Paper text:
Polycomb Repressive Complex 2 ([name]) is a histone methyltransferase complex composed of core subunits [name] (or Ezh1), [name], Suz12 and Rbbp4. [name] trimethylates histone H3K27 (H3K27me3) to mark developmentally repressed chromatin. [name] contains a split catalytic region composed of the SET domain and the SET Activation Loop (SAL) but is inactive without minimally associating with [name] and the VEFS domain of Suz12 [Suz12(VEFS)]4–8. Pyridone inhibitors bind to [name] in an extended pocket that overlaps with the SAM binding site.
Author numbering:
A (entry chain B): 81 to 394, 400 to 440
B (entry chain A): 31 to 74, 81 to 124, 261 to 308, 432 to 472, 517 to 730, 2562 to 2687
The structure:
């Protein structure tokens, strides 16, 4: 369904573990994506005739950092984009590509950080999934740690991925403990945190802002996959999540007809709705992605086959090229779902266009 | 088979419309914003990109990020103050009632109550209440009387005052027609060399059911104060005073207070000094102390999870790979583990020339690990102790590992008695019982929270514990319709030999004063 038109390579030959198109792009403005890897984030623009233009690049002060992921977000009242990046050191920098300086930084995660996402309806709430067994909900606007997901009933091993739902009401996480845990965020207890995290003021009250430790998930299960889980994205009220088993799996928790907004924590049954079967992809940390209207599903593997899927099976169309050789860590479509950028282990990029 | 294939797509397509209708509102919110794009940098060492397909190789300057001070490694743990043990009948209150014996109406209470810590299905003591520890017209109104004939004996004009729905003498017709301590129990047998306490080399405590003057019970001490030198047999036996026995030193005086006359009970009350977290001067996270501490003064209870020796053996496999063990031997049979749940003091690093030491003292049957100062400690030293014997700076928060600036580091003390996760976790464990009815369940939840809110640790306190429960939570008792189960709770308290008889009369009196209002 696609067609490749360009290939790239950087100057460090180190792996790149994620890319995102800034889906907050304007209407009629050029498509822009960003690349994390090594100790450096590189931003890129698209142009006519398969030209990929190099915009700007930022390197962190020490070469020991190994960035893993990134995600875009607009400012509320300044209209600039912000691209938060986090890696092995567990620090989350912001780095706006307008003034080109580390505008904010948040220390204090217990280990590395393995995935980042933003709330869909609030561009001020940032969720970080960490190796320290816990998820954390930051607040870019007001410099406040809202929550910590993972206490006694939290993720007992290393956590690797999560994703908000579509409307922005219920997070779902997973990690190297074979578990997928739903943490709703529409309860009035999580909501009065988001409210009071704005009306907090450091020099207005000699009392640090009360961060909400969530010890008990709103649902948990280890019945879907066998070994570790390294990716997870919502599907509205269904959930896709893969493992090193050469298969992305669809599933809803509870019974078939039991609504997701009424399933209470102690529910133990699932309903596996099927699997997307693929081949040769079976190592640590290999995500997928989906376009903005969620008809596409793109995954890469270790030898360079760049799978695609039609999500309206109401069709294992593949993408392969003679030089696409190393592994594919992550893919990301453009907002209008026209360009598919994939990154590799040998510090290379590939640009695919739909027709 | 043909049925489930058809339910997949009917739900898929209904789920699909949910995708469409939601994704539009995000798209509609996208047409609201006019956000600027990314543009190249000509303002400013250099990065370069080549193309594997015939295209000019592009170079731009490399904008360096300012360095950011990293923090040491820390894994997800949960706040704790009192230890945590780990493993390796119709309702008589509302519309549907029944008439059962004395033991069937109270069955869940005798088995689910803990004689030692005063909570239902506690978290420390796994063994249930030993047998003789709990022996000292509709269907509901009649099953109540059935409970009282074992408790209220032959008083007729008073039993009618309780049940309220009938009157005095008409009742007649019903009458017509180093090892861990566990309480020892053996009727018709004295506490001899066949007793678990004697076999374990442990003294029987107040919880034992052996004879009152059993030759194995620890008696307590008669000191006037301090209890802090070899002179006091409580101290001399490596024990904290028993606050139902040592009435002279102060372990039973001013339970609200934290600095009592008796100084050898600072663990059971939780009078632990203030601890602060910061990066260690060796490597990693370390703990420092806020205010100065004398020689041989109590710092904190080293707290954690209680695991078996067999569970400690499996966890010693996983712990060995990081060269970092956080477990300590509590006694021969049990081990404490601060890796998953612990308190602030679990951040004391090892050193062979330390200023603190660990003493495994005994508190009301429970062996606990106390941390004490080996010498005097002044403001801002990092506390160390030797792991072998038991197995102007930047301060950080405990729960979040964020910087705790000096503005409000005085009465913070992020270490209460009842944490938020336990107050819920005990509710999880009450409801999960499938053999207990939910009318009795919704009262034991109220008691467990009341106990933890005040911090009760003495048998003598239980008169005030049941009288304070009515003053605060009795309103939720009537609104949730549990006034009858609350009476069952009282006669279960009275069956366990730790409440006064006139308090059961005084407690119901204060409930009915608000009920008829
Ligand atoms: C199987 C689990 C494993 C055994 N485990 C459990 C815990 C609770 C824990 C921690 C941890 O909670 N610590 C905080 C801390 C405490 C609590 C107390 C003190 C005195 N001090 C501290 O720091 C850290 C590490 C770990 C691993 C590798 C590592 N290295 C790699 C980078 N280069 C330096 C060496 N560093 C630390 C392992 C842990
Ligand atoms: Zn107990
Ligand atoms: Zn009478
Ligand atoms: Zn005994
Ligand atoms: Zn005995
Ligand atoms: Zn005895
Ligand atoms: Zn004494
Ligand atoms: Zn004493
Ligand atoms: Zn004493």
């Amino acid at each position: 369904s696609f067609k490749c038109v360009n290939s790239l390579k950087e100057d460090h030959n180190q792996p790149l573990f994620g890319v995102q198109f800034n889906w907050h792009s304007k209407e009629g403005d050029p498509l822009v994506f960003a690349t994390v890897g090594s100790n450096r984030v590189t931003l890129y623009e698209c142009h006519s005739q398969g030209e990929i233009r190099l915009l700007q690049s930022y390197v962190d002060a020490d070469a020991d950092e190994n960035f893993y992921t990134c995600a875009w977000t607009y400012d509320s009242n300044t209209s600039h984009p912000l691209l938060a990046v986090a890696g092995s050191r567990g620090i989350i920098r912001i780095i706006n590509p307008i003034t080109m300086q580390c505008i904010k930084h948040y220390v204090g995660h217990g280990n590395a950080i393995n995935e980042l996402k933003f709330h869909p309806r609030d561009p001020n709430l940032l969720l970080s999934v960490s190796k320290d067994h816990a998820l954390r909900l930051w607040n870019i606007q007001t410099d406040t740690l809202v929550a910590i997901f993972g206490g006694v009933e939290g993720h007992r091993d290393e956590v690797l991925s999560a994703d908000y739902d579509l409307l922005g009401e219920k997070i779902m996480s997973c990690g190297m403990d074979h578990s997928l845990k739903l943490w709703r965020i529409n309860s009035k207890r999580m909501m009065n945190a988001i409210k009071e995290s704005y009306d907090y003021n450091p020099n207005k009250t000699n009392r640090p802002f009360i961060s909400q430790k969530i010890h008990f998930p709103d649902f948990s299960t280890r019945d879907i996959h066998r070994n570790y889980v390294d990716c997870v994205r919502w599907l509205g009220d269904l959930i896709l999540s893969k493992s090193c088993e050469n298969a992305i799996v669809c599933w809803k928790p509870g019974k078939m007809e039991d609504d997701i907004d009424k399933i209470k924590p102690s529910e133990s049954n699932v309903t596996i709705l099927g699997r997307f079967d693929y081949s040769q992809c079976d190592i640590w940390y290999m995500r997928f992605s989906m376009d903005f209207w969620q008809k596409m599903l793109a995954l890469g593997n270790q030898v360079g086959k760049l799978y695609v899927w039609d999500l309206e099976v109401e069709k294992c169309t593949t993408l392969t090229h003679h030089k696409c050789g190393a592994a594919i860590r992550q893919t990301s479509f453009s907002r209008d779902s026209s360009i598919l950028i994939a990154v590799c282990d040998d510090a290379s990029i590939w640009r695919w266009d739909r027709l | 088979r043909f049925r489930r294939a058809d339910e997949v797509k009917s739900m898929f397509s209904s789920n699909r419309q949910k995708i469409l209708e939601r994704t539009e509102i995000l798209n509609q919110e996208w047409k609201q914003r006019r956000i600027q794009p990314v543009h190249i940098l000509t303002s400013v060492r250099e990065c370069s990109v080549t193309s594997d397909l015939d295209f000019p190789t592009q170079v731009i300057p490399l904008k360096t990020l300012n360095a950011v001070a990293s923090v040491p490694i820390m894994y997800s743990w949960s706040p704790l103050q009192q230890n945590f043990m780990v493993e390796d009948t119709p309702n008589i209150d509302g519309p549907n009632a029944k008439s059962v014996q004395r033991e069937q109406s109270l069955h869940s209470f005798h088995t689910l109550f803990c004689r030692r810590c005063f909570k239902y299905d506690c978290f420390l003591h796994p063994f249930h209440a030993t047998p003789n520890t709990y022996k000292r017209w509709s269907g509901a109104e009649a099953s109540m009387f059935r409970v009282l004939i074992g408790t209220y004996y032959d008083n007729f004009c008073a039993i009618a005052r309780l049940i309220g729905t009938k009157t005095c003498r008409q009742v007649y017709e019903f009458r017509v027609k180093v090892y861990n301590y566990q309480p020892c129990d053996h009727p018709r047998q004295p506490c001899d060399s066949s007793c678990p306490c004697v076999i374990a080399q442990n003294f029987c405590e107040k919880f034992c059911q052996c004879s009152s003057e059993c030759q194995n019970r620890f008696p307590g001490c008669r000191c006037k104060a301090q209890c802090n030198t070899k002179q006091c047999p409580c101290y001399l036996a490596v024990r904290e005073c028993d606050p139902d026995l040592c009435l002279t030193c102060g372990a039973a005086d001013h339970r609200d207070s934290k600095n009592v006359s008796c100084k050898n009970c600072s663990i059971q009350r939780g009078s632990k000094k203030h601890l602060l977290l910061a990066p260690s001067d060796v490597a990693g996270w370390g703990i420092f102390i806020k205010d100065p501490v004398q020689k041989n003064e109590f710092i904190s209870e080293y707290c954690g999870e209680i695991i078996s020796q067999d569970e400690a053996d499996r966890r010693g496999k996983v712990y060995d790979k990081y060269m970092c063990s956080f477990l300590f031997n509590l006694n021969n049979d049990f081990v404490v583990d601060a890796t998953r749940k612990g308190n602030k003091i679990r951040f004391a690093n090892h050193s062979v020339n330390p200023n603190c030491y660990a003493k495994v003292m005994m508190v009301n049957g429970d062996h606990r690990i106390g941390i004490f100062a080996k010498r005097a400690i002044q403001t801002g030293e990092e506390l160390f102790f030797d792991y072998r014997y038991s197995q102007n700076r930047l301060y950080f928060h405990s729960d979040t590992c964020l910087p705790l600036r000096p503005q409000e580091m005085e009465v913070d003390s992020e270490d209460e008695k009842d944490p938020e996760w336990l107050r819920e976790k005990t509710i999880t464990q009450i409801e999960e019982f499938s053999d207990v009815n939910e009318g009795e369940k919704e009262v034991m939840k109220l008691w467990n929270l009341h106990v933890m809110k005040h911090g009760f640790i003495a048998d003598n306190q239980m008169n005030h514990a049941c009288m304070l429960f009515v003053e605060n939570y009795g309103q939720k008792i009537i609104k949730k319709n549990l006034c009858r189960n609350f009476m069952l709770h009282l006669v279960s308290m009275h069956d366990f030999n730790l409440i006064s008889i006139m308090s059961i009369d005084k407690a119901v009196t204060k409930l009915r004063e608000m009920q008829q209002k």
